[PDB]
Scaffold this active site. Structure first.
Site, short mmCIF file in Angstrom:
data_model
loop_
_atom_site.label_atom_id
_atom_site.label_comp_id
_atom_site.label_asym_id
_atom_site.label_seq_id
_atom_site.Cartn_x
_atom_site.Cartn_y
_atom_site.Cartn_z
N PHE A 22 0.77 -1.23 0.00
CA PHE A 22 0.00 0.00 0.00
C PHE A 22 0.81 1.29 0.00
CE2 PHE A 22 -3.93 -2.30 0.61
CZ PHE A 22 -3.48 -3.48 1.22
N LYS A 40 6.84 8.79 3.03
CA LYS A 40 6.05 7.60 2.75
C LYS A 40 4.85 8.03 1.91
CE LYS A 40 3.32 4.02 5.04
NZ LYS A 40 3.19 3.17 6.27
N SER A 89 11.49 10.71 9.79
CA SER A 89 12.92 10.79 10.01
C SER A 89 13.52 9.77 9.06
CB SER A 89 13.29 10.35 11.41
OG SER A 89 12.24 10.63 12.29
N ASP A 134 3.52 -5.49 15.61
CA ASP A 134 4.31 -6.04 14.53
C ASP A 134 5.76 -5.66 14.72
OD1 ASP A 134 4.91 -7.45 12.28
OD2 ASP A 134 4.53 -5.76 10.92
N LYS A 136 9.64 -6.14 15.11
CA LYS A 136 10.66 -7.03 14.53
C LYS A 136 11.89 -6.24 14.13
CE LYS A 136 8.08 -6.84 10.26
NZ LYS A 136 7.43 -7.55 9.13
N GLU A 138 13.21 -5.68 11.39
CA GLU A 138 13.04 -4.90 10.15
C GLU A 138 12.39 -3.56 10.47
OE1 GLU A 138 12.45 -8.27 10.73
OE2 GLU A 138 11.66 -9.13 8.84
N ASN A 139 11.63 -3.52 11.56
CA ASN A 139 10.91 -2.33 12.02
C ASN A 139 11.68 -1.54 13.05
OD1 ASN A 139 8.68 -2.55 10.52
ND2 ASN A 139 7.46 -3.59 12.08
N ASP A 152 6.95 1.82 11.48
CA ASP A 152 5.86 0.98 11.00
C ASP A 152 4.73 0.88 12.02
OD1 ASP A 152 4.45 -0.69 9.26
OD2 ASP A 152 5.38 -2.52 10.09
N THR A 166 4.20 -10.27 11.52
CA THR A 166 5.01 -11.29 10.89
C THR A 166 4.98 -12.61 11.66
OG1 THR A 166 6.38 -9.62 9.84
CG2 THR A 166 7.38 -11.78 10.14
C1 LIG Z 1 10.72 -3.69 6.34
N1 LIG Z 1 11.17 -2.75 5.30
C2 LIG Z 1 10.37 -2.67 4.06
C3 LIG Z 1 11.90 -1.53 5.68
C4 LIG Z 1 11.98 -1.29 7.19
C5 LIG Z 1 10.66 -0.81 7.80
N2 LIG Z 1 10.40 0.63 7.60
C6 LIG Z 1 11.35 1.57 7.55
C7 LIG Z 1 10.75 2.76 7.46
C8 LIG Z 1 11.49 3.93 7.47
C9 LIG Z 1 12.74 4.17 6.92
C10 LIG Z 1 13.47 3.33 6.07
C11 LIG Z 1 14.80 3.31 6.14
N3 LIG Z 1 15.25 2.45 5.23
C12 LIG Z 1 14.25 1.90 4.55
C13 LIG Z 1 14.20 0.96 3.52
C14 LIG Z 1 12.96 0.57 3.02
C15 LIG Z 1 11.79 1.12 3.53
C16 LIG Z 1 11.86 2.06 4.56
C17 LIG Z 1 13.09 2.45 5.07
C18 LIG Z 1 13.15 5.44 7.30
O1 LIG Z 1 14.21 6.00 7.04
N4 LIG Z 1 12.16 5.92 8.04
C19 LIG Z 1 11.14 5.08 8.19
O2 LIG Z 1 10.12 5.27 8.85
C20 LIG Z 1 9.38 2.53 7.45
C21 LIG Z 1 8.28 3.38 7.41
C22 LIG Z 1 6.99 2.86 7.46
C23 LIG Z 1 6.80 1.48 7.55
C24 LIG Z 1 7.89 0.62 7.58
C25 LIG Z 1 9.18 1.15 7.54
#
Ligand SMILES: CN(C)CCCn1cc(C2=C(c3c[nH]c4ccccc34)C(=O)NC2=O)c2ccccc21
Length: 278
Positions: A22, A40, A89, A134, A136, A138-139, A152, A166
């Site tokens: 999305f 975003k 940020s 959620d 993790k 990655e977040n 996230d 996840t």
């Molecule tokens: C799990 N992936 C796709 C990337 C990490 C999770 N993630 C990073 C971000 C953010 C950042 C990211 C920083 N590096 C990234 C690479 C892919 C996607 C997002 C980011 C960032 O600098 N600031 C954020 O909020 C993000 C924002 C909304 C939802 C999920 C987000």
């Protein structure tokens, strides 16, 4: 009286940091100030068709309520005829998962430092009656200073059962009652602490169903040289009975949790000001 609403042309968009079902996060530099933000972008039509308005609304409404160093900050929002923009940020050092893979397995000094920042960040989140749902690696981003910055929040929930994060971090109560609470985040934490030390999450299998199967039977084990105090901690978080997890109100909250022996040497009052161990 806040600053004029910003607009796309105020920026110079660059590389796409990532794409979700999305939305798309793109690195943008604000022309007037040279400030680099992670914007975003969500397409209104898609959101409307898939009934996500409650989610986008919530994500926006939660982030506006947060004001703490371990969380991604929402600087602004605006929209045009087709999209929604969130100025966030830009965490320069990526995500915690990247590091876990990159270095493989964190030793005790880093495991203790990073876990602490997470515990400290949830205590704040949960203090405001909000649950992530959620959590993790990655977040859990890392800023240029190497401190964490959690993001996230679209799937977050404000307290007063429609989502599942996840699979490898899903709590068992989520797989039996269909309803998350603070406990679900503490479960995820346990999983993450385990992942920092072991290099991989506790529950793993060929598909989701097999993962869920392990979770509810609490089927996992620790490697031979897993820091003992860390193991003990994880054993008190990964507990099927949600109401008996370190950190839950039923267990008297964050006081006991932050007091765990594993955190003996930690100074909680200002983790943000300490230097992360390289
Ligand atoms: C799990 N992936 C796709 C990337 C990490 C999770 N993630 C990073 C971000 C953010 C950042 C990211 C920083 N590096 C990234 C690479 C892919 C996607 C997002 C980011 C960032 O600098 N600031 C954020 O909020 C993000 C924002 C909304 C939802 C999920 C987000």
């Amino acid at each position: 009286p806040q600053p004029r609403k910003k607009r796309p042309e105020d920026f110079k968009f660059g590389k796409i940091l990532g794409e979700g079902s999305f939305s798309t996060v793109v690195l943008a530099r604000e022309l007037a100030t040279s400030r680099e933000y992670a914007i975003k972008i969500l397409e209104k039509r898609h959101i409307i068709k898939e009934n996500k308005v409650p989610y986008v609304t919530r994500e926006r409404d939660v982030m506006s309520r947060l004001d703490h160093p371990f969380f991604v900050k929402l600087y602004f929002t605006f929209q045009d005829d087709e999209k929604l923009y969130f100025g966030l940020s830009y965490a320069k050092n990526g995500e915690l998962l990247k590091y876990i893979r990159k270095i493989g397995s964190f030793d005790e000094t880093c495991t203790r430092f990073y876990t602490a920042e997470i515990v400290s960040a949830l205590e704040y989140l949960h203090g405001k009656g909000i649950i992530h749902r959620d959590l993790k690696p990655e977040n859990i981003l890392l800023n240029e200073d190497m401190h964490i910055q959690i993001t996230d929040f679209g799937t977050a929930k404000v307290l007063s059962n429609s989502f599942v994060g996840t699979a490898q971090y899903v709590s068992p109560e989520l797989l039996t009652e269909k309803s998350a609470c603070k406990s679900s985040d503490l479960w995820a934490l346990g999983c993450i602490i385990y992942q920092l030390v072991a290099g991989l999450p506790p529950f793993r299998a060929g598909n989701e169903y097999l993962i869920f199967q392990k979770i509810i039977k609490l089927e996992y084990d620790f490697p031979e040289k897993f820091f003992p105090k860390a193991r003990d901690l994880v054993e008190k978080l990964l507990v099927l009975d949600a109401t008996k997890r370190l950190g839950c109100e039923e267990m008297e909250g964050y006081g006991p949790l932050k007091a765990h022996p594993f955190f003996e040497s930690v100074t909680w009052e200002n983790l943000h000001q300490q230097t992360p161990p390289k």
